[PDB]
Design a protein around this ligand. Structure first.
Ligand SMILES: [Mg+2]
Ligand SMILES: [Mg+2]
Ligand SMILES: [Mg+2]
Ligand SMILES: [Mg+2]
Ligand SMILES: [Mg+2]
Ligand SMILES: [Mg+2]
Ligand SMILES: [Mg+2]
Ligand SMILES: [Mg+2]
Ligand SMILES: [Mg+2]
Ligand SMILES: [Mg+2]
Ligand SMILES: [Mg+2]
Ligand SMILES: [Mg+2]
Ligand SMILES: [Mg+2]
Ligand SMILES: [Mg+2]
Ligand SMILES: [Mg+2]
Ligand SMILES: [Mg+2]
Ligand SMILES: [Mg+2]
Ligand SMILES: [Mg+2]
Ligand SMILES: [Mg+2]
Ligand SMILES: [Mg+2]
Ligand SMILES: [Mg+2]
Ligand SMILES: [Mg+2]
Ligand SMILES: [Mg+2]
Ligand SMILES: [Mg+2]
Ligand SMILES: [Mg+2]
Ligand SMILES: [Mg+2]
Ligand SMILES: [Mg+2]
Ligand SMILES: [Mg+2]
Ligand SMILES: [Mg+2]
Ligand SMILES: [Mg+2]
Ligand SMILES: [Mg+2]
Ligand SMILES: [Mg+2]
Ligand SMILES: [Mg+2]
Ligand SMILES: [Mg+2]
Ligand SMILES: [Mg+2]
Ligand SMILES: [Mg+2]
Ligand SMILES: [Mg+2]
Ligand SMILES: [Mg+2]
Ligand SMILES: [Mg+2]
Ligand SMILES: [Mg+2]
Ligand SMILES: [Mg+2]
Ligand SMILES: [Mg+2]
Ligand SMILES: [Mg+2]
Ligand SMILES: [Mg+2]
Ligand SMILES: [Mg+2]
Lengths: 141, 149, 73, 129, 82
RNA sequence: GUUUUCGGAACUGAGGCCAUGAUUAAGAGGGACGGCCGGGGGCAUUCGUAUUGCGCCGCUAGAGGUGAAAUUCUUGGACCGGCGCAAGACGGACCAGAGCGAAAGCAUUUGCCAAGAAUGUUUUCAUUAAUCAAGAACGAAAGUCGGAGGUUCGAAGACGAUCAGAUACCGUCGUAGUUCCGACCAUAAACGAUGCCGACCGGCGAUGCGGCGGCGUUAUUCCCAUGACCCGCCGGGCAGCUUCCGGGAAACCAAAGUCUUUGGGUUCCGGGGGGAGUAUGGUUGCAAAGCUGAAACUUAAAGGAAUUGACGGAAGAGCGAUUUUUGUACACACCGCCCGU
RNA sequence: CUUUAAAUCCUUUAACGAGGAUCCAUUGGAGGGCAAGUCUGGUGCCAGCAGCCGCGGUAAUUCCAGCUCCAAUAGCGUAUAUUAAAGUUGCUGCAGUUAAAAAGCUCGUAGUUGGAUCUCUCUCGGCCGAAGCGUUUACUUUGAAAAAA
């Protein structure tokens, strides 16, 4: 049982402080290894240069080819696989282009069939993919 | 339960409700005190004196008759041992176990029991230091133990 | 009592932790100046000290009264 | 070892009340226990009790009326200010129409309402309802 | 069960309990006056004696200690006190 | 100017006087004492068959081993029967839901040495107590280093079988080891998978120890008294049956109860499944290894109890699904599931 | 005109100024969680959607569209840090037989916790004034001092 003495405040506080480290999220947030390993460095978005176009096979029981791009970030130079979400939006991206990339929605965890992909493309060549998809803006060229 | 055993016995004494000396007892306080002095001079601890008085002279409780305890009577007279009897018995038992153990090196149970006995000795010595019955430098050492008792 | 004309005393207290509604034991050490007028001062007796100007690097109090321990005979 | 006597007495009373017994024997006695039982009896929860006097710490025989739902002790005895009493009332009592918190104040051992009337704080001992 | 007068146990109830578990503690022992046939002196003996009791006048063994009670020598008579 | 008034401080003597000054002895704990109790511990001593080997004697061609055989030993007398001798290891039956020990663990007789629980107590002390960072003693088996012995068994190994294949299961040998002494090692499903101290809360019948009481049978040729039975009571102990005490997901538990009616004291310890008790640092060890002990990354479940089926080289009541025995990690239901190269 | 250093804006006021009052409201959704269509046309485990469960392999309530329908509204989606939800860090208030879990066992220092009991004062000065109080604390109730925002 727990100690209920009137002078046990140090014991209780010390025990709680030491047992908080067995929480996955607390340790992840306060240890610093996750922040060091995070390619974004704690940012919501980033800018990169499209190295190339790749196709990732969807995990079973689904069968598909998800269109992604390999890009390299400008601030740290790390290489990243980002997802281009829409029907035919991969034709809006060219090689050596500059793209804005955001997270996939699960805080560094993979989403859906796509294995090991945690980033998605937002803007290409300084125009949003939504505007290109809906035909509101054209590629600068 | 016991301090150093799992046993949880209940055997002990139950003093009567009445504190008045029974009518049949013809002894006075002075006669009881003289008997206590003679027994102490014979070389008996207060526990043995109380046992003898209970068994032979019909003295159920000296504190009820004389109004005082055996050890306090001895201290007032001056016939009291330097160190308390229970600590003396503990040290004597430790000495006996240590004398046995030196001739029997493979007796691990003797070593365990000696550790327990010395722990009890340390407890009692610390308690007696707190009450200033012992000087605040008295120490139990195995070599000195034989000479102490 | 090992320095020349200055001793080390200990002050004990309890610190309150609001979250748990409880206390923890804490202590502080003070180096104080002891005048030669106070003799027969032993370890473990109560001392009443008063504040003065800094007498040295770590001494700011002076012994004003000495009261013996409970075991005095 | 036994370190709280009021806790044992209240636990024994509660266990005997759950079983439908008519009387409870609690030992050892204590004047704190007597004050707590007097506070309970003034509100009609227990009834008359008798103190058996042996030459060592005494005993109590308590009559039961069947009106007691729960009697308990609070350990440790926390200091309660007069402005923090409503929080303990919300935490421990079942309703705002019945139930009492027992406090030891400098005026004596009483309930929380009597401590509000006399405008004093103290230390919480237990509760009953 | 659910109805028992704890204040007023029967006299047989309190002699069946353990000596410490009674309402008020009371020992199970007693003192007795013993007389040996050889010598006329009356000796007071505790029932649960732990020492051999010798007659002062004539050095006769009045009793022998055992585990629970002390057994009197053959031919010795005893009477309880009070 | 002296001393004495007055005032302040210190040291000596018997006085009077106090109701003269010690609360109780915990169904708390220590320490005495009494009769017992126990495969508890150490040392020495003693006995018992059995197994192996050796010596001699008798008659003999087989013996051993297996599902079946072979490797193996045998007219240089095997196996079997008898009479002795020697060594080493183990104490059968009695032996039990019995006892002791802190746990590992503990069983031939006798003696010595120290230790202990429980019971009995109108003995003594008077709070001396509970749990415990640091720090310590002990700690199965296996393993390591020196000595002594090496009967049996026997990792490794050599063979003979089986098999599609066996590097396994089976059989013949057989090295470390298994045994004792002295130093290390500190690990077990080291388990009741259940920390210790204290209080309360239903019945029943046994059982081990101590004590108390009581008709009656037996032995000590008589008498008490003490042993063996019988009927009860009390206190600790190992357990059992029963119960709508109450708990819990249930299995089940008189504790795993007295928990949203949530607080008796205190120690250790868990936070979805893997990576992983792995890497690295520190520390201990002769070594083997022991203690402390991550992260990157990966994943939507893994897991507990119970139910209905299907399989098997097995014989009114429950929260609820639900209402021949049994096991299941199967439910696309053994044509299953699943592990490692 | 007023406003103001001078202006601008707001307010006050002439004249003009609304029928498709075209002087046009958007952002996300329509399987469940969660409000709202197994309506029609394409595609056919492709393209794609989908925080999660899942949808799509020729009759797709989920993709691409049309129609219709929901939610908030001059606002509405997305990524990330953080709070509640979390009684999933538990002091209030969690667990440790079998789901993750009690050290192999014992001793023991520090720490934590600890059985009953016990119903203002002389003197000096003008009833109060000075002086000693309290064996001292903890507690509780007062009072004083405590920057604004
Ligand atoms: Mg699919
Ligand atoms: Mg202990
Ligand atoms: Mg005893
Ligand atoms: Mg709080
Ligand atoms: Mg022996
Ligand atoms: Mg032969
Ligand atoms: Mg035991
Ligand atoms: Mg035998
Ligand atoms: Mg340790
Ligand atoms: Mg071993
Ligand atoms: Mg070995
Ligand atoms: Mg060797
Ligand atoms: Mg073999
Ligand atoms: Mg062999
Ligand atoms: Mg282990
Ligand atoms: Mg087991
Ligand atoms: Mg375990
Ligand atoms: Mg029994
Ligand atoms: Mg026994
Ligand atoms: Mg018996
Ligand atoms: Mg709780
Ligand atoms: Mg985990
Ligand atoms: Mg993870
Ligand atoms: Mg039905
Ligand atoms: Mg029903
Ligand atoms: Mg099975
Ligand atoms: Mg089944
Ligand atoms: Mg829309
Ligand atoms: Mg649509
Ligand atoms: Mg929805
Ligand atoms: Mg709906
Ligand atoms: Mg899925
Ligand atoms: Mg179609
Ligand atoms: Mg369609
Ligand atoms: Mg939160
Ligand atoms: Mg909440
Ligand atoms: Mg979490
Ligand atoms: Mg609550
Ligand atoms: Mg939990
Ligand atoms: Mg487990
Ligand atoms: Mg265990
Ligand atoms: Mg301690
Ligand atoms: Mg107290
Ligand atoms: Mg301020
Ligand atoms: Mg302010």
């Amino acid at each position: 049982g727990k100690c209920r003495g009137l002078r046990t405040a140090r014991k209780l506080r010390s025990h709680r402080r030491d047992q908080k480290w067995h929480d996955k999220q607390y340790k992840k947030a306060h240890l610093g290894t996750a922040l060091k390993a995070n390619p974004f460095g704690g940012a919501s978005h980033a800018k990169g240069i499209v190295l190339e176009k790749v196709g990732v096979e969807a995990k079973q029981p689904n069968s598909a080819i998800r269109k992604c791009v390999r890009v390299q970030l400008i601030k740290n130079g790390k290489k990243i696989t980002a997802f281009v979400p829409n029907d035919g939006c991969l034709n809006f991206i060219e090689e050596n282009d500059e793209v804005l990339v955001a997270g996939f929605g699960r805080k560094g965890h993979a989403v859906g069939d796509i294995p090991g992909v945690r980033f998605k493309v937002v803007k290409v060549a300084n125009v949003s993919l939504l505007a290109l998809y809906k035909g509101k803006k054209e590629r600068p060229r | 339960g016991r301090m150093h055993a799992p046993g949880k016995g209940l055997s002990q004494s139950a003093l009567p409700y009445r504190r008045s000396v029974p009518t049949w007892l013809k002894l006075t306080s002075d006669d009881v005190k003289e008997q206590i002095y003679k027994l102490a001079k014979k070389g008996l601890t207060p526990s043995q004196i109380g046992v003898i008085l209970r068994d032979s002279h019909g003295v159920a409780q000296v504190r009820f008759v004389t109004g005082n305890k055996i050890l306090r009577i001895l201290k007032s007279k001056g016939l009291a041992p330097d160190l308390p009897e229970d600590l003396y018995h503990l040290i004597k038992k430790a000495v006996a176990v240590r004398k046995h153990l030196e001739r029997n090196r493979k007796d691990k149970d003797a070593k365990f029991r000696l550790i327990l006995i010395e722990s009890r000795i340390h407890r009692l010595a610390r308690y007696y230091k707190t009450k200033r019955v012992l000087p605040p430098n008295w120490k139990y050492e195995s070599s000195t133990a034989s000479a102490l008792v | 009592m090992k320095m020349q004309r200055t001793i080390v005393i200990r002050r004990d207290y309890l610190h309150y932790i609001r979250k748990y509604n409880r206390f923890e034991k804490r202590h502080k050490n003070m180096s104080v100046h002891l005048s030669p007028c106070f003799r027969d001062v032993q370890i473990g007796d109560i001392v009443t000290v008063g504040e003065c100007r800094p007498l040295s690097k770590t001494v700011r109090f002076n012994v004003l009264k000495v009261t013996k321990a409970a075991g005095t005979k | 070892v036994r370190m709280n006597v009021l806790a044992d007495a209240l636990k024994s009373i509660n266990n005997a009340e759950k079983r439908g017994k008519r009387q409870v024997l609690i030992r050892p006695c204590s004047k704190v226990i007597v004050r707590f039982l007097t506070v309970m009896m003034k509100h009609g929860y227990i009834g008359e009790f008798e103190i058996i006097d042996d030459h060592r710490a005494g005993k109590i025989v308590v009559n039961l009326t069947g009106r007691l739902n729960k009697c308990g002790v609070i350990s440790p005895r926390f200091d309660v200010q007069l402005k923090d009493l409503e929080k303990w009332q919300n935490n421990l009592l079942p309703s705002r129409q019945f139930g009492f918190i027992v406090l030891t104040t400098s005026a004596g051992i009483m309930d929380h309402e009597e401590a509000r009337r006399k405008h004093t704080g103290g230390k919480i001992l237990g509760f009953f309802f | 069960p659910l109805a028992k007068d704890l204040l007023h146990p029967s006299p047989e109830e309190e002699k069946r309990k353990h000596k410490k578990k009674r309402l008020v503690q009371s020992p199970n022992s007693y003192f007795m006056d013993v007389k040996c046939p050889g010598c006329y002196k009356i000796t007071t003996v505790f029932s649960h004696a732990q020492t051999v009791v010798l007659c002062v006048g004539c050095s006769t063994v009045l009793c022998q200690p055992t585990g629970g009670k002390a057994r009197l020598t053959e031919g010795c008579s005893f009477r309880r006190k009070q």
